[PDB]
Structure 1
Amino acid sequence: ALTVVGDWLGDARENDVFEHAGARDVIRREDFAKTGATTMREVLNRIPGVSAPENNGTGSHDLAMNFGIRGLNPRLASRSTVLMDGIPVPFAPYGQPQLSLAPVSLGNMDAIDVVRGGGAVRYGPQSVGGVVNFVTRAIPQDFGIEAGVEGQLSPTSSQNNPKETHNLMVGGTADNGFGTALLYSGTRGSDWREHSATRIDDLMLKSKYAPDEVHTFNSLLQYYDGEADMPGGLSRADYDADRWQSTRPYDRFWGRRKLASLGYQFQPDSQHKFNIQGFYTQTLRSGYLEQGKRITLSPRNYWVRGIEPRYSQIFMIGPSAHEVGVGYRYLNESTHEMRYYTATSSGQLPSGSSPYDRDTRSGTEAHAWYLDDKIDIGNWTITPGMRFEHIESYQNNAITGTHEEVSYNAPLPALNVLYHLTDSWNLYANTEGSFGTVQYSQIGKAVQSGNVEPEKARTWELGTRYDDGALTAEMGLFLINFNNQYDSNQTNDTVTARGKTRHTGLETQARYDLGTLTPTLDNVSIYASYAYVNAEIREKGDTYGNLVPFSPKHKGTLGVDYKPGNWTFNLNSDFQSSQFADNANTVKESADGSTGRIPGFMLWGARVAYDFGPQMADLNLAFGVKNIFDQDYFIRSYDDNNKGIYAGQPRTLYMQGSLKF
């Protein structure tokens, strides 16, 4: 009976995902614990086409976030539109999308929605790598308390401090229609590396007001505060002698975020739906960093404010149904970057009274418009769409006295097709226009080269999704041509150089109830995810034909879940092929361990859990192991000041506990 969908991202509804005309996967809270995950990257790596490397480089700590889609640069997750409840996660979405500080926590999420394809019309910028939305816990219908905790240790490591992550959830909605939930997640501890002491406090206040069935308000308040020592990389020599140690004693990072979000929804009938959402974030991210013969301090402040009205309406036009969607977003961001320093030879860390060699202020004003129309005709669902952005960015240098500006547009036309083969089998194809902005650090290069234009990408997908209840599976191909990247892939970036890369591959995954074969395998489930990704450099120059760095060709997982009665037994494997660390693709390892072939690997993990039941508070206990065989591996950081080798996670033991009231 014609019902308007409107926001298909939202809380990642199972049905919206199945009906999604493009590559898209979701992992829900219920499945976080099975692999002992407490961090975002641990869940993201379980999704095909996604590579979320262990802490390294600038982001050599838990406050940052590292991940890349289909071979796009993983460092500081700048190639995908990262959001939490639709709200921009970056402290500078347009000018500085690098998540050196990523104020979000797994413990406060109900799910992770990765939309690799089909979201370039409604979401941006940095949409070349699809969109990733972190869905926050829902306000319980009726008063509810949930608490959980996980503890980890690496026996073979010299680091004896454990790592603990906890989460608290208390909330409910009163009969008057007003509900609010307190979501808190925290992290205390060190990983398997020395100099990794960490503290993170993520506190949110989520509210919902539905006096009636037409008017609904929503609010989200968050206070994120953290700090962490940064292990850093090791040269080959130090790594061989002791791979747990840190030779970057000064490296430390800290930051905080204050967020306020308010929204309103007007739905008169099931055919019309209006939405307006406004937000404001204040961010302070700083840290000590050893740089050459000096130690630096880099305070950076950010202000982001946005407002977005959206409208959705369905109507019949003959035998076809049309759900037209229109949206508008105004976003304004402001920044201030400073860098203090002292001589390392001296015995004091830099402070506000130390001299500084950088004092810049940047900002962006963006106007985004989008229009799409979901047309249901027969078994088809064709969706043509158009997104348009007008961006104005500037960088003001107080030391040099310069002031630079760039003004450009990003027109992105798209078309996605969904064809329903059967009640439980879909087909989809699509193409979208994606773009990367002119980052603040690239404005100088942009104006000097006289070419101010967005980083442009054109994606194409073809895939299928299946679910007969006993077997769920999906497979699809993707093609991505990403041009005019201000970051060149040549060994030497020049003013006029522009990066150009191609990403092609296959993504797939499946889950099967083996109980349909024999009662001997009842409650026995098997699964696997896999992605063949070939990211290549097609920029004319000294690296043309080479492979994009940090992009394994093969990556995925396989596992079996056995749930007899109240028990849960998990077995899982993570694997990926090798990767290069630089654009030149050098095979031979350098003495500082910053460059050279990075081996692939295959790890095994297991876990045993028990659900006690309704009375003693649905108590959940568990013990598990990551990297059972203690298989040795490592990743590298190439360009940053703490570059070098980073020991991969060794055999790690963990315990989990959770209560629900």
Structure 2
Amino acid sequence: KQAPGVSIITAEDIAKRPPSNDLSQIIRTMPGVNLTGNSSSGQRGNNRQIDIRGMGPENTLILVDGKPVSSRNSVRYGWRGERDSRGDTNWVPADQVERIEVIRGPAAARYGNGAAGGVVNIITKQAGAETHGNLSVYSNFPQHKAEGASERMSFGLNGPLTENLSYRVYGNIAKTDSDDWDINAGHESNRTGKQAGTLPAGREGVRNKDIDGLLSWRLTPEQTLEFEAGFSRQGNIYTGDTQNTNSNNYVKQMLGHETNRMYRETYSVTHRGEWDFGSSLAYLQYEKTRNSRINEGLAGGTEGIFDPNNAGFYTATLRDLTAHGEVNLPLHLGYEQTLTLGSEWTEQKLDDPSSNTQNTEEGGSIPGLAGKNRSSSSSARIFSLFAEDNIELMPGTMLTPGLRWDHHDIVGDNWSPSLNLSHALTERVTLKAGIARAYKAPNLYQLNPDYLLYSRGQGCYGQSTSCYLRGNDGLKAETSVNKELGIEYSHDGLVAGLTYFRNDYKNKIESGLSPVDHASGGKGDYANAAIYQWENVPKAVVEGLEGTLTLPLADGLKWSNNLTYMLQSKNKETGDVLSVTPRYTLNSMLDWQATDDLSLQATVTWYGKQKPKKYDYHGDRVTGSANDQLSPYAIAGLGGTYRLSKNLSLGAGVDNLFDKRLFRAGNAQGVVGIDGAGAATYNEPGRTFYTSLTASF
């Protein structure tokens, strides 16, 4: 379940610690994984997503059955590197998941674009020899009414049609109620003048509808052909969230209402080949995402609030195309090795009728940029070749060198080499070392010279004057040399391991610090605004420790621990943080198999201190409550699963036994009328009872 760099979560695991709704809840408990925003602003801070080794969630590649999920690329990427997105780990319903693979650092670089942090591969339950199916229900019950309860119903059904043609289908309906509009009342940052009365929001709610169909066709003994279609729909339940935590009547009108809906549609063709020489796989996925939400402004304090002058919904459309071919070849030589060879092709078309609409009246005009009716359209194609050689030098030792080459049709050529070594020092002890250079293509917002944000000064680096931020098709890809050295003892279910990891982070893309130019014209003081671009930061570094320890107390009883400790996270240009994570994270489960038919689980999570950014948007040291830190805290939980028969199981338990609660005070830094909240940017839910029921043949 735990080796150096890699973690498996099983169906049994998902069953014993059931997630409310989103899988982030259980994925986050792996070594090296945190649940954070992408950068340090704290904006959309209750919209936290999976972060691997402090590299940010933009650098965590989500797969379902080896096929990319790109849906969040349909939400506007803002000035501070946050999207008003709930993430991409809530597309597959928990109880139809067979297992989840988390691959962190050098082992993950081979998966290419956006695996700089690592890969999360959500694997579905597949067709059997006989026909099987299940019906799963979960429902939680919070102590405090403010906090949103969650309800979940999902079914699965698979088997053969013929001797040579199988199917699997699943369908899910779920809802997570929003936190009450006022849950953060009495905890909010100091708010004065026009902003008096404003509130930082609790967690957005969501309604889910997921339907997947798959047909497997075994054409010959050594040939399988898979067809699947996927239809999902998330509509939110709004509870007052805005980028800057400003308010207006339109905001208040929409409390309790759907203000965004994401439709995600997937069709996939997969051919799987198995013959004497070796093995083949190749797939075509077409992902179509419709991001329908309410118009928001793109300037200063109006960036990320419902725009009352332009009321109503727009729809952003993401058409994502993925094709991949691989062959694996057993090879006999001076060393017993295996060669895998592969191409990959991806196309991302983005239609956004809202992001590209900032006009140049107030700040003056930009040479090369039309003020009105700029294109809605952005697109990027990567072509990729790769080979990986998995070389046995001698029993116990694998050396795995791989080369990936990527041609980005704007940014240019990338060379991502990799080397992964594992060494049996003993039967019980294994040393593992890895150094790879991973790859990040700029997102379609960073890349687009039509994409334009504006501030009168309050968000401008190194001045108080009006300034534009502009997309930059001149950008380099972000690369990271992910190093890792680890050791693990494993024997008779006794596991003890410790890994050190360092990712040297080159060309991290971010809102610029120096004006590249000035505009001409516009109104009064705001006239002739400074122009910044999305720039590559030369150097940043993350560094830390992953530990695991599993002790079998008795035959019936297992004590498991995962440790993350984050040593360093530094933008070497500004000296500020990349992300804000807990200094450490210790997850502790006691698993007692009390009877043949009863299992009992106690868990504790310890979170270390959390520190905010040192510098504001200007680059100036922040002061007062913008410096506030979150103290270390713990969350404990009990549960059980009572098996009534081979065909019926029940679960029940309590998350957060001792009701430790935290409250979003606002964003990290001060603005006019809204004091900063430092690290206090998210809501930690209180005591919550839950029950579950699973019927299966």
Shift of 1:386: 0.7
Structure 2 residue 568 is matched with structure 1 residue 560? no
**d(CA) in 2 for partners of 1:71, 1:474:** 20
Structure 2 residue aligned with 1:35, among 11, 17, 22? 17
**TM-score, L = length of structure 1:** 0.80
Deviations 1:115-151 (A, max 9, x none): 0034445312112101111111122331111111110
Counterpart position of 1:241: none
Structure 2 residue 547 is matched with structure 1 residue 508? yes
Counterpart position of 1:217: 225
**d(CA) in 2 for partners of 1:373, 1:490:** 43
User: Taking every aligned residue pair, what percent have the same amino acid on both sides?
Assistant: 18
**d(CA) in 2 for partners of 1:142, 1:333:** 39
Counterpart position of 2:488: 465
Q: Do the aligned partners of residues 246 and 443 (structure 1) sit closer, same or farther apart at CA in structure 2, a change above 3 Å counting?
A: same
Q: 1:41-440 maps to which residues of 2 (within 5 A)?
A: 41-53=24-36, 58=44, 66-73=49-56, 77-91=57-71, 102=88, 103-158=91-146, 162-174=149-161, 176-194=163-181, 196-232=204-240, 252-269=259-276, 271-288=277-294, 292=302, 294-295=307-308, 297-318=313-334, 320-339=335-354, 360-378=376-394, 379-392=396-409, 406-440=410-444
Q: Please tell me whether the aligned partners of residues 46 and 683 of structure 2 are also in contact (alpha carbons under 8 angstroms).
A: no
Range with bigger deviation, 35-44 or 449-458 = 449-458
Q: Please tell me whether the aligned partners of residues 470 and 534 of structure 2 are also in contact (alpha carbons under 8 angstroms).
A: no
Shift of 1:193: 4.0
Q: Do the aligned partners of residues 426 and 211 (structure 1) sit closer, same or farther apart at CA in structure 2, a change above 3 Å counting?
A: farther
Structure 2 residue 590 is matched with structure 1 residue 608? no
Counterpart position of 1:578: 609
Partner-residue secondary structure (3-state), 1:480: strand
Range with bigger deviation, 414-423 or 145-154 = 414-423
Shift of 1:427: 1.8
Q: Please tell me whether the aligned partners of residues 126 and 436 of structure 1 are also in contact (alpha carbons under 8 angstroms).
A: yes
Counterpart position of 1:523: 556
Q: Please tell me whether the aligned partners of residues 166 and 217 of structure 2 are also in contact (alpha carbons under 8 angstroms).
A: yes
Cα RMSD, aligned residues only? 3.6
Code of the residue aligned with 1:660 in structure 2: it is: S
Counterpart position of 1:352: none
Q: Please tell me whether the aligned partners of residues 36 and 581 of structure 2 are also in contact (alpha carbons under 8 angstroms).
A: no
Shift of 1:201: 1.0
**d(CA) in 1 for partners of 2:373, 2:631:** 39
Counterpart position of 1:346: none
Deviations 1:169-212 (A, max 9, x none): 11113451321111222212415445844310111112322244
Q: Do the aligned partners of residues 477 and 174 (structure 1) sit closer, same or farther apart at CA in structure 2, a change above 3 Å counting?
A: same
Deviations 1:587-619 (A, max 9, x none): 8665xxx884234321111113211123xx2x1
**d(CA) in 2 for partners of 1:631, 1:491:** 44
Shift of 1:359: 5.8
Shift of 1:422: 3.9
Code of the residue aligned with 2:67 in structure 1: it is: I
Counterpart position of 1:348: none
Structure 2 residue 627 is matched with structure 1 residue 627? no
**d(CA) in 2 for partners of 1:480, 1:146:** 42
Q: Do the aligned partners of residues 307 and 333 (structure 1) sit closer, same or farther apart at CA in structure 2, a change above 3 Å counting?
A: same
**d(CA) in 2 for partners of 1:226, 1:450:** 32
**d(CA) in 1 for partners of 2:224, 2:390:** 25
Q: Do the aligned partners of residues 96 and 466 (structure 1) sit closer, same or farther apart at CA in structure 2, a change above 3 Å counting?
A: farther
**d(CA) in 1 for partners of 2:87, 2:96:** 17
Deviations 1:620-652 (A, max 9, x none): 112211111001224576389999744211111
Q: Do the aligned partners of residues 250 and 338 (structure 1) sit closer, same or farther apart at CA in structure 2, a change above 3 Å counting?
A: farther
Aligned length: 587
Q: Do the aligned partners of residues 251 and 268 (structure 1) sit closer, same or farther apart at CA in structure 2, a change above 3 Å counting?
A: closer
Deviations 1:218-242 (A, max 9, x none): 232211112012335599999xxxx
Partner-residue secondary structure (3-state), 2:318: strand
Q: Do the aligned partners of residues 249 and 183 (structure 1) sit closer, same or farther apart at CA in structure 2, a change above 3 Å counting?
A: closer
**d(CA) in 1 for partners of 2:93, 2:66:** 15
Q: Do the aligned partners of residues 429 and 283 (structure 1) sit closer, same or farther apart at CA in structure 2, a change above 3 Å counting?
A: same
**d(CA) in 1 for partners of 2:374, 2:627:** 29
Range with bigger deviation, 180-189 or 229-238 = 229-238
Q: Please tell me whether the aligned partners of residues 338 and 358 of structure 1 are also in contact (alpha carbons under 8 angstroms).
A: no
Q: Do the aligned partners of residues 251 and 535 (structure 1) sit closer, same or farther apart at CA in structure 2, a change above 3 Å counting?
A: farther
Q: Do the aligned partners of residues 361 and 477 (structure 1) sit closer, same or farther apart at CA in structure 2, a change above 3 Å counting?
A: same
Q: Please tell me whether the aligned partners of residues 121 and 385 of structure 1 are also in contact (alpha carbons under 8 angstroms).
A: no
Q: Do the aligned partners of residues 219 and 425 (structure 1) sit closer, same or farther apart at CA in structure 2, a change above 3 Å counting?
A: farther
Partner-residue secondary structure (3-state), 1:32: helix
- Which blocks of at least 5 consecutive residues in structure 1 are unaligned? 1-13, 239-244, 343-355, 393-405, 516-521
Partner-residue secondary structure (3-state), 2:26: helix
**d(CA) in 1 for partners of 2:139, 2:627:** 33
Structure 2 residue aligned with 1:486, among 509, 527, 549? 509
Q: Please tell me whether the aligned partners of residues 480 and 503 of structure 1 are also in contact (alpha carbons under 8 angstroms).
A: yes
Q: Please tell me whether the aligned partners of residues 92 and 333 of structure 1 are also in contact (alpha carbons under 8 angstroms).
A: no
Q: Please tell me whether the aligned partners of residues 106 and 483 of structure 2 are also in contact (alpha carbons under 8 angstroms).
A: no
Range with bigger deviation, 190-199 or 366-375 = 190-199
Shift of 1:53: 4.4
Q: Do the aligned partners of residues 175 and 109 (structure 1) sit closer, same or farther apart at CA in structure 2, a change above 3 Å counting?
A: same
Q: Do the aligned partners of residues 96 and 114 (structure 1) sit closer, same or farther apart at CA in structure 2, a change above 3 Å counting?
A: farther
Shift of 1:60: 5.0
**TM-score, L = length of structure 2:** 0.76
Q: 1:538-557 maps to which residues of 2 (within 5 A)?
A: 538-540=571-573, 543-544=574-575, 546-557=576-587
**d(CA) in 2 for partners of 1:637, 1:210:** 56
Structure 2 residue aligned with 1:441, among 445, 458, 477? 445
Partner-residue secondary structure (3-state), 1:487: strand
Partner-residue secondary structure (3-state), 1:107: helix
Q: Do the aligned partners of residues 417 and 236 (structure 1) sit closer, same or farther apart at CA in structure 2, a change above 3 Å counting?
A: closer
Q: Please tell me whether the aligned partners of residues 59 and 66 of structure 1 are also in contact (alpha carbons under 8 angstroms).
A: no
Counterpart position of 1:7: none
Code of the residue aligned with 1:80 in structure 2: it is: T
Q: Please tell me whether the aligned partners of residues 46 and 682 of structure 2 are also in contact (alpha carbons under 8 angstroms).
A: no
- Which blocks of at least 5 consecutive residues in structure 2 are unaligned? 78-82, 182-202, 247-251, 358-371, 450-468, 516-530
Range with bigger deviation, 173-182 or 581-590 = 581-590
